[PDB]
Amino acid sequence: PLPWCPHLVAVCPIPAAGLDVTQPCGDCGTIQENWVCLSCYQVYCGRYINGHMLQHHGNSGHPLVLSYIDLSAWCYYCQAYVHHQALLDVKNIAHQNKFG
Template identity: 55%
Template sequence: MAEQGSSNGAEGGKVSSNTDLLKQYEKQGVEAMYAVEPLSWCDHLQQVAPLPEAGLNVEDPCTDCEAKGENWVCLVCYKVYCSRYVASHMVTHGEAAGHPVVLSYADLSVWCYKCDNYVANEVLKPIIASAHKSKFGKEL
């Protein structure tokens, strides 16, 4: 006597909605986005020169003291200088040359000395992408 144990039609598919989870992520994302809101535009971006054909190399040493590591690159003349944690050569360069917009090889943020603020704008994207490729070995 064979009993047929399996019965079709029992749908175990209780599809749980991800919507609540997404909402939760969104909320967290917004709250944790920026401690300091970057400027979306500043007038000094007009001084930013196009990315050199060779691209950026985050390993470049400081022009003045040859310090290596987490340097900055000037986005007006593309010279590399060290941070204020080393000998502040980028600050010195910014003041001496009047080049206000610089990119950090440490965290790929763009800082404007004149505005004393971070700047995030479309025109900076290819520059940041080049630094990102050099730093992480892959496209942004």
């Protein structure tokens, strides 16, 4: 995984409501393999379910998404996982919600 990418500038502030790692897909309602968009904080499912987060990337151009299964961050433009200081706050808020 990359230690930086040129889309980190599109990571937006975390809503004051926080994250809900059990939130369903906003399109199909599945509870399985969802991701949260780090630009607009909508929640959509992964490629192995109904691919709604990939569709969101296509229709918005939003680059970076966070996995609610393992808290990895994927960039659709770079086609890589990214770790950076700029992702720690949102990873941490998710980790707290997920693990208690």
